[PDB]
């Protein structure tokens, strides 16, 4: 009778393999064996070894990672790691020939490096340093420093802040080279007049006065980061006089108040675009500038600016979607929300702004994965109308009506759930199935979509599971409204409809979220049906991601509204179903999951006997303004203050007076502040409500470490056995 | 009957009634009779009423407290009271003429005064703002400027750093007046050096970013602050030339080192006397310091220079006694430890170095309380060989051997633990007796001690508690090593020897501690015994006070040792009683108590199911120096940095496998910071161990607010109820 404990997940006793590559070529690949780098033939099977893990000793540091250079001469090793936020981080860099098995001393790249990147053709090398960029054309040769106005936590050349980090570009680098490499284009981020959060981190026990962190961070309202764009030739490039980076100023639509770069993509060599976003996240603008080489300046011409613009709520999912540009750059293909709220491609002429959507149905495109002189691909949740899977797909550029899925009948049955893959110039592609059955992988060839060899087939996992007590998932909808809202039940092994089980709802629902899905994953909620034989639900409501603007727009500028009475209205739903012990329901949630949870327990509605909030969000006050204003706008009184004041968890605390109450957060969390869950507990005090609580010492928002991740599992399956009076 | 609930203790349903009063004179004193300040005479109780319950009617403002000039023309009104440490604050302060019943109105004392004061005799005003000494002589006159330099966290004029406030003088004030009000003294701390605790206090809802505390804190072994003393003629103030401020520099042999001014007593009219400790504590010198009115200086004679010194441990009990001085100022009266190890008064001439102990035994003098020119009137533990009583005694000074006890007999049985305030030359004095009985407030005449009358004897709780299943006291002693040592016990009602019965050990256990006593107390272990049958024990082991240095030497150079195995040891000992029953003993504390609780938790002697630890102290360098460092040292490799390194709860992580663990603390504790109990969680989080944690957002080392009080024990009873398997 064995079973998936809570060691197993814990002690990762099922490995789930997967088959991470590197695409090298258009014919060529990497991956790791060994510790050794592999490189692969697509076509063939050609094996080769590449680099090997004997190489790297005497080399006295520990290697993280790695990256080879365009041209294949070259290979950066990363050491020295130090992490910083959520991609942001420090590491010491060395360079190694290759070709001349020789490590390189020669004007090394400092220790303490921000970040490193190589051009996308040749060696040239960028990298940040004391907030400062640096070139080195040549590995062996010194640098030219291109920006002098560094300066921590004030100016940041060609790295991001905190907010940008986070909510627009999800990386710590805002450096794009041109595809030739001879163009170097940069952001620079001014945080002078932005607030700082401050918080206390404790370290070893040996420290005997803890440290004051002090981050730059604007919360909901507040003065916000200023950025500029510049480009600079690389090529031309002085060694006795300092470079000139040529400005790109944003367009006056923008420059009239608070704004935003938000996406930058080179359409050629000579061609830039750069979209840009208003404070109020609604109005949206992208320029397409060229080089002249007359001037030496760049001219974004206003009969190529693209306006876009949203009247029912914020532009994009969580930002304006990329372009993708054809070859001569003339035009490009862009996910847009179309005139019945669904986003789908559309198709732009430079020159000409009314688009043409080269798709459209009631459902949405993720992501053009790749575009090429004859076909767009494009993953989506068409196949089946089920909104929670993902398929490949190809559009003829020449004829919209020739659409062919290259994933929905592989193994139909096994798979639902795809992402891909693909090589430099788009001949192959690598096919990832991450569900409903164990992950697939594949390698095909995109001439005549032939499926040329599995990668990894997790067969050596499947006869470990074959012995194990298994839960099993049960997607489906339920009709509100007239409309269809999906919701996933994990059940446990040898699900008695008849029985009744106590009931765990896993929460999210913060804007454009998705939690029913087909994909497949072992954890907490595997363990918790199989061992404790607890159905965890998850439901997709008012507000949710990926069905149409009409049910995700639902929330604007009314968060804890909408997606929280759904929650509730779902677990209503659940006990209707005649298989739920109406009397052990409870809700638990992380990040907006827990503010979601949070304000679900103080709605006062009895449904649920005990919940679980992990660093949940308190007041929107207190977040940031990137993400806080671009749902929720402007907490003023000619704005949305009132909704600000009135969605807050605190001013429900009199309602936690019924049920159990799990407050966790991390004391360095410098996302969702540990000041958010410190007025939590404030606000039940005062109201004098019994509640347990917990904090972990220097974690941060994952409470990712092996010990707190560890400890944390264990104390929420302790509270939620209890609540449901579990051996 | 009914019991006494929770309810009870947190709402304050059974109140004690108090009678204080202030001595005005050698025959009158003060009392506030339900807003109506009366003053009585004491010879008959003839009271008139010196002051209306209105006057203040239109005032406007609330106010917090009062002060009424000895020779009774002013009265100083204290409001706008905002507490900041655990006796500093400031306030806003209104004078009021008591002949013209009419308001003073120009120049007013400034708001944010922090500290005032009368002169001991006629009405003059010494106070300080911006950390700067300010003196009036009249009411309505302009003020005086003493000191300019003052600044904020840096120097301290008149008033106490952090830790002078908290480890030296239990006050904010470092004003000292002579007796007729002729010379103001002066302490003057300087913390430039000295580095600073910081944490997030996030005050209201409204409050966007928490704000940094930033607190001049010196820990264990770091810079401490320095001190100066000065003495300056307040009759003398020029209004054209600033102020003369002579000082009196520290003996030559404190100069040496570090060093605190730990004592200031005036003698007489020019003789004042002080007391200077080294950081290494064991080594005090006291100076008499006389005024020289041809030149205006102040000069103390090494004649009257008194070495006091230890061998066995720190000098005093929590630092230099203090002395009493005869009426022409040439002698004094002093505690002191003995050959034997006990505190006894030894009297002192002050040109002669060697004193003649006027009391002697195995027992101790807990204070001296009056000197009159034939008897010295002292408060002991003498009486029925029971350190935990207390009893005034009064001493012939031409004959030593004759000692007569005034409050022994008065009522034995109801009254074994009295205090004292005698009138401005001991004519009367008010007789306070603590318990073991409720407690009796009784009015005496110092002629032939004859009783006068009944003050308060609490009649009416006397009433109320009878309809109440009250617990019952028991102390006792058990024999370690051959040598007695006392614990109490709260027993619940009907006290059933035959039954077994569930134990909570209340700990505190610091030197000079002690939890044993013969006190009344309607507190939370009332309510444990009345209600939930729980026997309430506490226990003062080795480090324990008022029973010699033997026992509170103990410890010396090693905290964390013999009081927590002696802890243990006492709660192996009650488990061998039959009564007891030994699979349910908790044990809990408060500070000290709590890293005792900790220690005892970690120790893995498996006498102990579960425990609480509330703000507890985690590794001695994380505490204050003048504390820690008395029973330490410094936390050096010369030192004792091998034990300050041995004696962690982090050291212990281990053990606690074996136990439920509640740990508690307050986020705004600039005492035992936060720090503390982050250190210890994130100890048990490294390897894994399971406890109940809570943190209280804002609340200090007390936990005493309203509803952080009610939900703390709230809270804590919840975890010992179901420790304990109890409804
Ligand atoms: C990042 O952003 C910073 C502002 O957010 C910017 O710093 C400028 O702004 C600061 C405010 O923080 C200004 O103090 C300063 O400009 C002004 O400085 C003086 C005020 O203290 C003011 O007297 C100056 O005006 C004078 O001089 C100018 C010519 O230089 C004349 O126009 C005026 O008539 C007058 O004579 C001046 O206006 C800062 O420049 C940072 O520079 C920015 N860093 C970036 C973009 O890298
Ligand atoms: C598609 O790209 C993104 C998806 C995202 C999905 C969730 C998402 C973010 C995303 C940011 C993205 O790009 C910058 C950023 C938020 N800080 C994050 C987030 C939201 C919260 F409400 C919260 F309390 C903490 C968080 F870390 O949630
Ligand atoms: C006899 O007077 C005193 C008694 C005292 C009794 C306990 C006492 C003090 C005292 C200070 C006194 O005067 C300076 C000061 C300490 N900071 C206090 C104290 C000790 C601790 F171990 C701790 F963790 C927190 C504390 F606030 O304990
Ligand atoms: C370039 O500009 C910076 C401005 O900070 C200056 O300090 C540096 O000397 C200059 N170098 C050259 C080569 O002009
Ligand atoms: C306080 O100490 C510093 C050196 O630590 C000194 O420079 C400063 O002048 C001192 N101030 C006073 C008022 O003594």
Request: charge should be negative; aromatic fraction near 14%.
């Amino acid at each position: 009778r064995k079973t998936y404990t809570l060691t197993d997940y814990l002690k990762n006793t099922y490995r789930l393999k997967l088959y991470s590559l590197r695409w090298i070529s258009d014919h060529e690949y990497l991956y790791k064996q060994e510790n050794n780098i592999l490189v692969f033939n697509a076509e063939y099977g050609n094996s080769s070894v590449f680099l090997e893990n004997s190489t790297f000793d005497e080399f006295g540091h520990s290697i993280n990672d790695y990256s080879i250079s365009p041209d294949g001469q070259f290979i950066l090793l990363e050491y020295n790691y130090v992490k910083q936020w959520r991609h942001s981080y420090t590491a010491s860099y060395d360079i190694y020939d290759l070709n001349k098995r020789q490590l390189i001393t020669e004007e090394r790249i400092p220790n303490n490096t921000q970040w490193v990147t190589w051009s996308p053709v040749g060696h040239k090398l960028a990298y940040v340093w004391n907030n400062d960029i640096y070139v080195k054309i040549e590995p062996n040769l010194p640098s030219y420093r291109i920006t002098w106005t560094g300066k921590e936590d004030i100016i940041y050349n060609g790295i991001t802040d905190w907010v940008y980090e986070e909510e627009v570009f999800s990386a710590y680098s805002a450096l794009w080279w041109s595809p030739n490499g001879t163009f170097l284009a940069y952001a620079q981020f001014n945080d002078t007049e932005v607030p700082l959060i401050e918080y206390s981190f404790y370290s070893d026990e040996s420290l005997q006065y803890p440290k004051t962190v002090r981050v730059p961070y604007p919360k909901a309202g507040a003065v916000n980061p200023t950025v500029k764009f510049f480009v600079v030739n690389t090529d031309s490039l002085s060694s006795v006089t300092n470079a000139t980076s040529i400005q790109i100023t944003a367009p006056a639509s923008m420059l009239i108040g608070d704004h935003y770069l938000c996406d930058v993509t080179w359409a050629t060599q000579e061609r830039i675009s750069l979209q840009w976003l208003r404070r109020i996240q609604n109005y949206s603008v992208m320029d397409i500038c060229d080089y002249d080489e007359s001037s030496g300046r760049w001219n974004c011409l206003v009969a190529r600016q693209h306006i876009e613009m949203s009247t029912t709520g914020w532009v994009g999912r969580f930002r304006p979607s990329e372009p993708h540009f054809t070859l001569d750059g003339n035009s490009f293909y862009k996910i847009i929300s179309n005139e019945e709220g669904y986003r789908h491609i559309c198709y732009f002429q430079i020159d000409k702004k009314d688009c043409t959507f080269i798709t459209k149905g009631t459902w949405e495109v993720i992501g053009i994965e790749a575009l090429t002189s004859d076909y767009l691909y494009y993953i989506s949740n068409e196949y089946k109308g089920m909104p929670g899977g993902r398929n490949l797909y190809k559009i003829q550029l020449s004829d919209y009506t020739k659409v062919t899925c290259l994933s929905c009948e592989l193994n139909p049955e096994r798979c639902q759930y795809y992402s891909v893959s693909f090589s430099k110039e788009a001949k192959y592609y690598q096919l990832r199935c991450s569900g409903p059955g164990l992950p697939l992988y594949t390698l095909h060839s995109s001439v005549n979509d032939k499926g040329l060899r599995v990668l990894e087939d997790n067969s050596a996992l499947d006869k470990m599971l074959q012995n194990v007590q298994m839960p099993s998932k049960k997607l489906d909808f339920i009709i509100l409204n007239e409309t269809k809202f999906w919701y996933q039940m994990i059940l446990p092994p040898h699900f008695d409809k008849s029985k009744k089980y106590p009931l765990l709802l896993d929460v999210y629902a913060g804007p454009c979220s998705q939690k029913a899905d087909t994909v497949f994953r072992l954890n907490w909620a595997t363990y918790l049906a199989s061992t404790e034989n607890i159905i965890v639900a998850s439901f997709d409501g008012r507000g949710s991601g990926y069905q149409g603007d009409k049910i995700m727009h639902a929330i604007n500028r009314r968060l804890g509204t909408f997606e929280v009475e759904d929650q509730i209205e779902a677990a209503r739903q659940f006990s209707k179903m005649g298989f739920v012990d109406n009397k052990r329901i409870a809700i638990w949630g992380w990040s907006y999951g827990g503010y979601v949870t949070s304000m679900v327990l103080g709605s006062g509605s009895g449904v649920f006997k005990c919940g679980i909030a992990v660093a949940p969000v308190s007041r929107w006050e207190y977040y940031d303004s990137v993400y806080t204003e671009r749902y929720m706008g402007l907490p003023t009184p000619e704005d949305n203050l009132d909704h600000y004041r009135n969605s807050t968890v605190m001013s429900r605390a009199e309602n936690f007076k019924q049920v159990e109450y799990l407050l966790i957060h991390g004391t360095a969390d410098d996302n969702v502040h540990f000041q958010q869950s410190a007025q939590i507990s404030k606000a039940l005090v005062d109201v004098g409500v019994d509640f347990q609580a917990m904090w972990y010492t220097d974690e941060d928002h994952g409470i990712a470490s092996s010990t707190a991740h560890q400890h944390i599992y264990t104390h929420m399956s302790h509270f939620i056995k209890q609540c449901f009076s579990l051996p």
